[PDB]
């Protein structure tokens, strides 16, 4: 059991140690400030930002990264490790191969109708299901990208305390967004989670923080075929502020970690909205604030309504508090359901483990509406 921190983090070392270890990396990425923004909201849940210096072709600018957690250090490390993950993802010509030795079938990535299928830039990865090297498009690895094959996105990027930690996290994120994609397609999301039987004290603390703030939380089960918990936490503010209709989605082998991640992400979504620094937050502030509250509740009906309730005790728990064993389990479940490749690319750039994970055939529709496979509809039918 290499997972030493089980209660909130599911990591090999403490957040305090992570923060100590990444100090050099944080200067290398040109960090300008790291701040807590809890005060913007009424829920008293830790949310951090990190701002870093960026040059977008000509002008100097700022990139922002948000962090979430049950306590202060977790939220701060979350922001820092997102910033490092995202910095590590930028295009690196030293990794580019022009002639692919063993190219993936690019169709399996689920391509938009406008995809330029003439890939000129390839990157080598390791398929850890089949234990072989494989070449994947650069557009599927780096961020940002030229956007030739598809629009660049951050799905399956992760940093961590070691290689396996980053791989596990990025894999869980792929699983998360695939499941979220299926939920977005589904006409109904029938199953509510009652968190009363949580063994983890931090779930109760978080739920109670929302109640006192007059924020109604509903938990929805999005768990897909793999029996890897995916949970949506949806906030409904008694203030009827349309901008406070927010979702957080958590994914983990342990259902209580998934719930913790969903609950803290809700606070993160709310706080980044209220911060209004990001382009999407600013635009949501401008346009969605004019959308009547009752229209939004009506549009997103399926998220709030429910046909049945389960307990956490009803949810699968295949966590073993050991990275290699957890990865083994996931590999088996992916293979079992025809997801026969689990590919990672090493993106370590500033002395911190960072990867891209690619699991061909996993859906990204929730991020990019232009990408949706024929097989998603049957999957939705089966689960929902």
């Amino acid at each position: 059991m290499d997972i030493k921190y089980k209660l909130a983090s599911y990591r090999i070392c403490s957040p305090e140690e992570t923060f100590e270890k990444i100090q050099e990396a944080l200067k290398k990425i040109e960090t300008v400030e790291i701040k807590n923004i809890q005060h913007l909201d009424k829920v008293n849940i830790p949310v951090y930002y990190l701002k870093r210096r960026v040059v977008v072709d000509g002008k100097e600018g700022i990139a922002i990264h948000y962090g979430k957690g049950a306590n202060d250090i977790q939220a701060k490390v979350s922001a820092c490790m997102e910033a490092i993950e995202r910095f590590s993802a930028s295009y690196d010509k030293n990794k580019v191969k022009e002639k692919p030795d063993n190219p993936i079938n690019v169709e399996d990535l689920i391509l938009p109708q406008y995809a330029d299928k003439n890939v000129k830039e390839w990157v080598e990865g390791i398929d850890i299901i089949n234990n072989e090297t494989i070449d994947v498009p650069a557009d599927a690895v780096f961020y940002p990208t030229s956007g030739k094959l598809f629009r660049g996105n951050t799905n399956g990027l992760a940093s961590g305390n070691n290689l396996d930690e980053a791989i596990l996290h990025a894999t869980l994120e792929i699983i998360e967004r695939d499941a979220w994609s299926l939920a977005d397609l589904a006409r109904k999301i029938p199953t509510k989670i009652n968190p009363e039987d949580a063994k983890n004290p931090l779930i109760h603390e978080l739920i109670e923080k929302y109640e006192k703030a007059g924020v109604k939380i509903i938990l929805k089960d999005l768990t897909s075929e793999f029996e890897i918990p995916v949970v949506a936490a949806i906030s409904d503010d008694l203030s009827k502020n349309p901008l406070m209709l927010c979702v957080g989605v958590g994914c983990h082998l342990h259902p209580e970690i998934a719930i913790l991640r969903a609950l803290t992400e809700v606070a993160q979504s709310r706080a980044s909205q209220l911060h209004g620094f990001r382009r999407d937050a600013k635009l949501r502030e401008e346009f969605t604030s004019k959308i009547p509250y009752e229209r939004l509740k009506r549009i997103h009906r399926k998220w709030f309504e429910f046909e049945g309730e389960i307990n956490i005790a009803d949810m699968p728990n295949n966590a073993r508090y050991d990275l290699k064993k957890d990865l083994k389990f996931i590999k088996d479940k992916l293979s079992e359901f025809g997801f026969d490749k689990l590919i990672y690319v090493d993106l370590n750039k500033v002395g911190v483990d960072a990867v891209r994970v690619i699991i061909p055939k996993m859906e990204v529709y929730t991020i990019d509406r232009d990408r949706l496979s024929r097989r998603a509809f049957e999957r939705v039918k089966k689960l929902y």
Partner: peptide, 12 residues
């Protein structure tokens, strides 16, 4: 349009 969310960037 959408519910508020956080966790990814997508280029336009």
């Amino acid at each position: 349009g959408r519910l508020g969310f956080y966790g990814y960037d997508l280029q336009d």
